[PDB]
Design a protein around this ligand. Structure first.
Ligand SMILES: CN[C@@H]1CCc2c(ccc(O)c2O)[C@H]1O
Length: 281
């Protein structure tokens, strides 16, 4: 008396993610004046989120509900590679957007010279290629597999595939994918908030006779609350295997996926985006 329910939730999540990604992508594509250096970074993130919602979630849902994987093992390896690719690409695109905002605010006169139409494509391609090399190379080449009897049983067993990794690979992947972007974003947003506070203190001297805090808080808190616990459990569970089981791991992992759906809503809030959406519907 619970199988008929959770499928509804999974379908709702899939539909929400797909619709949110497609609307933003088509709004940027089909309108004349929405092209901007900043919007391309949003386009890359939307493309990554669309791939995640289209490929990763539906098969994982079938695996969880059925409890049996009715395909091959090479397909499981490919699915894992695609999952890692999409996650790391999304995180790195977020950090790139943050750095672009820092460059725009800190140095207004020289903002044009640093970033142009030509130099955004190279950055996007580098982000995507470093995301791809992090996932496909260690996975598709059989170079992450564990050496325990329980893990080798899973690898040899064709029906069921579960994620087991050596501690070194887990630490390196987590460090490359999560910690450095978090540090960068923290530093960027601290500096930006300081600059905003300085300007708000400067205006009151002449204009005699909060909002930025709320905006920065929401922007940072969404990402932190969505993705932080998973990358803590990932590091901790490998050093000592007694503490954590598979169910908690899966629950913490599935929380991160929902973040991809929320992100177009938080980033696409400009009045121009609102007018573009209004023109469609
Ligand atoms: C199947 N779930 C995977 C398992 C481990 C992992 C994920 C995402 C990014 C990484 O860098 C990882 O090492 C998760 O999405």
């Amino acid at each position: 008396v619970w199988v008929v329910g959770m499928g509804i939730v999974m379908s709702l999540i899939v539909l929400a993610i797909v619709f949110g990604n497609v609307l933003v992508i088509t709004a940027i594509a089909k309108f004349e004046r929405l092209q901007t250096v900043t919007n391309y970074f949003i386009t890359s993130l939307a493309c990554a989120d669309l791939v995640m919602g289209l490929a990763v979630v539906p098969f994982g849902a079938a695996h969880i509900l059925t409890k049996t994987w009715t395909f091959g093992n090479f397909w499981c390896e490919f699915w894992t590679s695609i999952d890692v690719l999409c996650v790391t690409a999304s995180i790195e695109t977020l950090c790139v957007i943050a750095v672009d905002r820092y460059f725009a605010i800190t140095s207004p006169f020289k903002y044009q010279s640093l970033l142009t139409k030509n130099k955004a494509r190279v950055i996007i391609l580098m982000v995507w290629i470093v995301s791809g090399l992090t996932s496909f190379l260690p996975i598709q080449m059989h170079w992450y597999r564990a050496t325990h009897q329980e893990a080798i049983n899973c690898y040899a067993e064709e029906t069921c595939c579960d994620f087991f990794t050596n501690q070194a690979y887990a630490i390196a992947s987590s460090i490359v994918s999560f910690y450095v972007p978090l540090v960068i974003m923290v530093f960027v947003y601290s500096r930006v908030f300081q600059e905003a506070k300085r300007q708000l203190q400067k205006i009151d001297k002449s204009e005699g006779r909060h909002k930025a805090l709320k905006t920065l808080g929401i922007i940072m808190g969404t990402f932190t609350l969505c993705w932080l616990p998973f990358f803590i459990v990932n590091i901790v569970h490998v050093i000592q295997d007694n503490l954590i089981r598979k169910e908690v791991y899966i629950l913490l992992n599935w929380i991160g996926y929902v973040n991809s759906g929320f992100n177009p809503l938080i980033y696409c809030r400009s009045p121009d985006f609102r007018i573009a959406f209004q023109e469609l519907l």
